[PDB]
Design a protein around this ligand. Structure first.
Ligand SMILES: [Ca+2]
Lengths: 139, 152, 728
């Protein structure tokens, strides 16, 4: 993998692994969550762990996290799949356009996918800046 | 029809059926452009005859019903160089292979199965057709390009 | 923009549009809606109403290409509706002259037009018919050139109905030929004052091409207007014994008396003035005036047969230089009505003999013994006419027009055959005038209609029934042109004749006296030795018989010249300019033979084309066979065209009738497609051009679609959520 991404993971696993026993337990998660923001219900915590075959050492940890962030394209690769509809090369897409593309073209999105997506989207002046949004969605 | 050509229908059917929402069905209003991609250039009168529609939404079609639309639009007549040269001559009073931009425009937009004003400025710019000082153009050249293809 | 050509120069789905019969317009512009066996349903373009029409009653039309065409032979369709439309189109625009083959058509303007000026005559001089707008001058100017170059006599038969333009146009022709003599022009004022007669005037020319003489021939003067008329120099008064009141004499106050725009005072003076210039001794011209005034007096003689006075019957004997006694004597008991009718027989006979004498005399003034080369005759007579009631008068006019027809046909036969000879088309074939002969013969030949009547007059016993029976006796069933009266104010009919331009039901009642006269051979003796020198000459030392010899004379004459037919048409019955009545106009079309010219044409080749202009217009009908006379050999060959519907030619192609209209069908229907196919080609090019940009985008969208769904589901991950939380 990558270093800097790891350095955090560990220091993280540390703050999460409250009972400082080098393992993450239903009580470990529940514990720290509450010390900050609302925490998940038993069912959430349960299936949240079942996501890891055996005990949660800093290994099966980095394992499931890495298998999440796997299968992703570059910030360059995406910024282009975008400029592929930015004929004039203005570095912006007209909102009605993009919304139209995603909504009923190719692998049609859904209203929720649609809302979830634009709830964040950086649109101001009719034009949806796909650069700033490619970053936000990436690094 | 040749297996290879059915595979080709397949190839293109996808690019399309995908763009109007991938689901293994194509808007009958595109059946024209589909075949226009496999070389052929049917006439709107032609397309509707097999199943085409005036608007989107009207209806979608599978690849099963698509095969015969293309079997159909194949046996339909295409124009030779002779024919395009003949017809264009009837607008030349001089007889020296000329015409004016303005008139050519009229022929395309006003006569026969009309052509929008956009497709015109389009193909003009594409084929990069140019007029002289008097504003005339050699219709012989033009016909040759259009006949040529977008990539010669 | 030239002032001289103001009233002289001219300013669709071939399967939907057509001509459908009409009652008001003769033919209506229709657009077909639905067929149904024979019941076609069309829409009238005008009012936009709808109706059905037998399929075989539809007529083909002409494209806007031939609007107000100057020469109708150049039209695709020459049918009663295309012709009537072209004329009426021109007419309502001032243009009253139009050609149609070798025929010139004049539509009465009923208004004065600035087209006969000397300005205009200058421009028509020596011009070839195609070179300048259609005009009567052109017809005249051309006959001149032909007589000159061809060295032969010319002749114009100006025909039409009564009130059409026969006279006006005859005069303009002479006025024209005269401008490019004084007595000639002056013969009209006197003949017009006295005349209802047929006129053939020949104008002779000398070795320097100038007028060197002239003669006049007249035919069948009426005679009836003298004593009957349907409704609507003081010094001389004592010489004629007349009271200056016209409404006083029965024989001339029946119908009208005065005449909007005719000053009888001044016309009399000028008529008198003209007798002098003509070189008429004072006695001569007073003999005329008296005999004519006598007619007025002859009609004042009352009765009871015995007389009822003698005052008026003397003035008569006086003016004619005979004894009033010896007169009324040989009039009441030749050696009450039988008399009043022989009075009329006398009046009429005098005037005729008079009118006849008058013409003979004006020809005297004219037969200058100078040197003659060739001439140019002008014919102003009566064409075919069918009325409610037809009698001897009509048979005579009709019999006349029939022999004229053969002529007009013939000329065309001769003419036609030159082309096929010039071109090299193969059609020896037989002559044309040939149909027609059956009717001519039924009337003129040895035992004919007239010959029967002529031999029936010589019998005092005869009557309207022995004549009628003696007729069927000879031609009923022995000649198919002669047919029992058919079915309909159509007065009595005793038999029917099938004339070139129509079927005429003739009533033979009174035909025996019509043909033989009846003035007392007694009074003819009185006047035979009268004191007046004129009267003596007039009675010095049948109609059909005279007219026979007469017609043959005119025919052998005409057949020695080169004919030019001018048809006059009375646009309407109300005498107003620019208004057309279609029904009236149309009517003429048949019996006017413009319709006969079309017929004769349709039997061969009408539409003729120079390969040069043919290739240019019909190449687009088989271009995949064209690597001018062979190109067409190819095109028409490609089209797998029937050798029948067309012919060879050295310099031109000959297409049977209609065919060319049908080629403009294809020939058009074909140019549209091709244009579409090149538009299709343009549609297909633009599509295929944008084929790449649609693959790249297909990918570039799948990236975004799959890669947003990821970042979407990653935010819905408890682990990540909690992770992000710890972060700081
Ligand atoms: Ca689809």
């Amino acid at each position: 993998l990558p270093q800097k991404q790891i350095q955090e993971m560990k220091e993280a696993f540390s703050m999460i692994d409250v009972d400082r026993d080098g393992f993450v337990s239903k009580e470990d998660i529940k514990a720290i969550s509450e010390q900050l923001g609302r925490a998940p219900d038993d069912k959430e915590l349960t299936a949240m762990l079942k996501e890891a075959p055996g005990p949660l050492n800093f290994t099966m940890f980095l394992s499931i996290f890495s298998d999440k962030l796997s299968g992703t394209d570059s910030e360059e690769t995406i910024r282009n799949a975008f400029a592929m509809f930015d004929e004039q090369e203005t570095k912006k897409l007209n909102i009605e356009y993009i919304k139209d593309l995603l909504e009923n073209m190719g692998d049609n999105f859904n209203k929720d996918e649609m809302r979830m997506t634009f709830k964040e989207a950086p649109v101001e002046g009719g034009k949806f800046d796909y650069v700033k949004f490619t970053a936000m969605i990436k690094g | 029809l040749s297996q290879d050509e059915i595979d080709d229908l397949k190839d293109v059917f996808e690019l399309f059926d995908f763009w109007d929402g991938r689901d293994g069905a194509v808007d009958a209003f595109k059946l024209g452009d589909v075949c226009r991609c496999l070389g052929i250039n049917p006439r709107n009168e032609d397309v509707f005859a097999v199943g085409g529609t005036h608007k989107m939404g009207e209806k979608s079609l599978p690849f099963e019903e698509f095969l015969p639309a293309y079997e159909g639009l194949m046996d339909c007549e295409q124009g030779t160089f002779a024919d395009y040269m003949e017809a264009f001559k009837t607008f030349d009073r001089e007889g020296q292979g000329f015409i004016s931009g303005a008139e050519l425009r009229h022929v395309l937009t006003a006569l026969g199965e009309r052509l929008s004003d956009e497709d015109v400025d389009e193909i003009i710019k594409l084929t990069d057709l140019q007029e002289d000082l008097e504003g005339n153009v050699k219709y012989e050249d033009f016909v040759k390009k259009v006949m040529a293809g977008p990539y010669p | 923009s030239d002032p001289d050509f103001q009233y002289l120069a001219v300013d669709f789905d071939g399967k939907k549009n057509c001509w459908v019969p009409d009652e008001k317009e003769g033919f209506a512009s229709a657009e077909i809606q639905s067929s149904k066996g024979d019941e076609i349903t069309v829409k009238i373009v005008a009012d936009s109403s709808t109706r059905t029409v037998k399929k075989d009653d539809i007529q083909s039309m002409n494209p806007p290409k031939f609007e107000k065409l100057e020469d109708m032979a150049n039209m695709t369709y020459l049918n009663e509706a295309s012709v009537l439309y072209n004329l009426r189109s021109r007419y309502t625009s001032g243009l009253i002259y139009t050609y149609s083959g070798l025929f010139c058509i004049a539509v009465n303007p009923y208004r004065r037009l600035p087209i006969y000026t000397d300005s205009v005559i200058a421009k028509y001089r020596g011009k070839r018919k195609t070179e300048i707008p259609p005009h009567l001058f052109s017809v005249a100017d051309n006959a001149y050139q032909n007589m000159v170059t061809d060295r032969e006599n010319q002749s114009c038969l100006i025909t039409g109905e009564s009130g059409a333009g026969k006279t006006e146009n005859t005069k303009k022709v002479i006025m024209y030929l005269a401008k490019v003599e004084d007595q000639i022009i002056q013969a009209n004022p006197v003949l017009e004052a006295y005349g209802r007669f047929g006129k053939f005037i020949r104008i002779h020319f000398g070795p320097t091409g100038k007028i060197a003489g002239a003669d006049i021939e007249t035919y069948l003067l009426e005679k009836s207007r003298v004593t009957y008329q349907q409704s609507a120099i003081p010094e001389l008064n004592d010489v004629m014994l007349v009271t200056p009141d016209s409404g006083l004499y029965s024989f001339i106050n029946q119908g009208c008396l005065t005449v909007d725009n005719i000053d009888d005072v001044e016309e009399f003076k000028l008529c008198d003035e003209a007798f002098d210039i003509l070189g008429f001794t004072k006695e001569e011209k007073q003999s005329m005036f008296k005999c004519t005034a006598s007619i007025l007096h002859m009609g004042e003689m009352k009765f009871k047969a015995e007389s009822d006075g003698t005052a008026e019957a003397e003035k008569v004997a006086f003016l004619c230089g005979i004894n009033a006694g010896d007169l009324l004597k040989a009039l009441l008991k030749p050696k009450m009505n039988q008399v009043v009718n022989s009075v009329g027989a006398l009046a009429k006979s005098l005037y005729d003999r008079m009118f006849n004498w008058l013409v003979r005399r004006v020809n005297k003034t004219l037969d200058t013994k100078a040197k003659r080369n060739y001439y140019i005759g002008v014919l102003d007579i009566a064409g075919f006419e069918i009325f409610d009631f037809n009698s001897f008068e009509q048979l005579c006019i009709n019999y006349t027009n029939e022999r004229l027809q053969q002529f007009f046909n013939h000329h065309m036969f001769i003419l036609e055959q030159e082309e096929y000879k010039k071109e090299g088309i193969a059609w020896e074939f037989i002559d044309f005038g040939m149909d027609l002969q059956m009717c001519i013969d039924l009337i003129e030949k040895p035992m004919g209609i007239l010959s029967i009547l002529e031999e029936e007059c010589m019998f005092p016993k005869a009557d309207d029934k022995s004549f009628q029976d003696k007729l069927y006796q000879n031609h009923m069933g022995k000649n198919r042109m002669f047919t029992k009266p058919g079915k309909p104010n159509q007065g009595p009919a005793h038999f029917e004749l099938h004339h070139y331009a129509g079927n005429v039901p003739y009533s033979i009642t009174g035909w025996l006296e019509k043909n033989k006269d009846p003035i007392n051979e007694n009074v003819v003796a009185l006047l035979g030795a009268s004191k007046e020198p004129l009267v003596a000459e007039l009675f010095k030392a049948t109609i059909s018989a005279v007219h026979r010899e007469s017609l043959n004379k005119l025919m052998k004459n005409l057949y020695s010249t080169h004919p030019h037919f001018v048809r006059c048409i009375i646009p309407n019955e109300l005498k107003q300019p620019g208004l057309v009545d279609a029904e009236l106009v149309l009517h003429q079309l048949q019996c006017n033979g413009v319709l006969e010219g079309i017929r004769i044409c349709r039997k061969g080749f009408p539409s003729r084309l120079i390969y040069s202009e043919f290739k240019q217009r019909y190449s687009i009908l088989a271009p995949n066979a064209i690597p001018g006379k062979t190109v067409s050999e190819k095109i028409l060959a490609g089209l797998q065209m029937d050798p029948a519907e067309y012919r060879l030619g050295t310099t031109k192609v000959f297409f049977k009738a209609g065919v060319l209209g049908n080629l403009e069908e294809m020939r058009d229907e074909r140019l549209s497609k091709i244009i579409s196919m090149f538009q299709a080609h343009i549609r297909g090019y633009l599509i295929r051009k944008a084929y790449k940009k649609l693959q790249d985008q297909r990918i570039g969208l799948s990236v975004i679609q799959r890669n947003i769904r990821k970042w979407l589901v990653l935010r819905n991950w408890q682990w990540w959520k909690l992770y992000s939380k710890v972060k700081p």
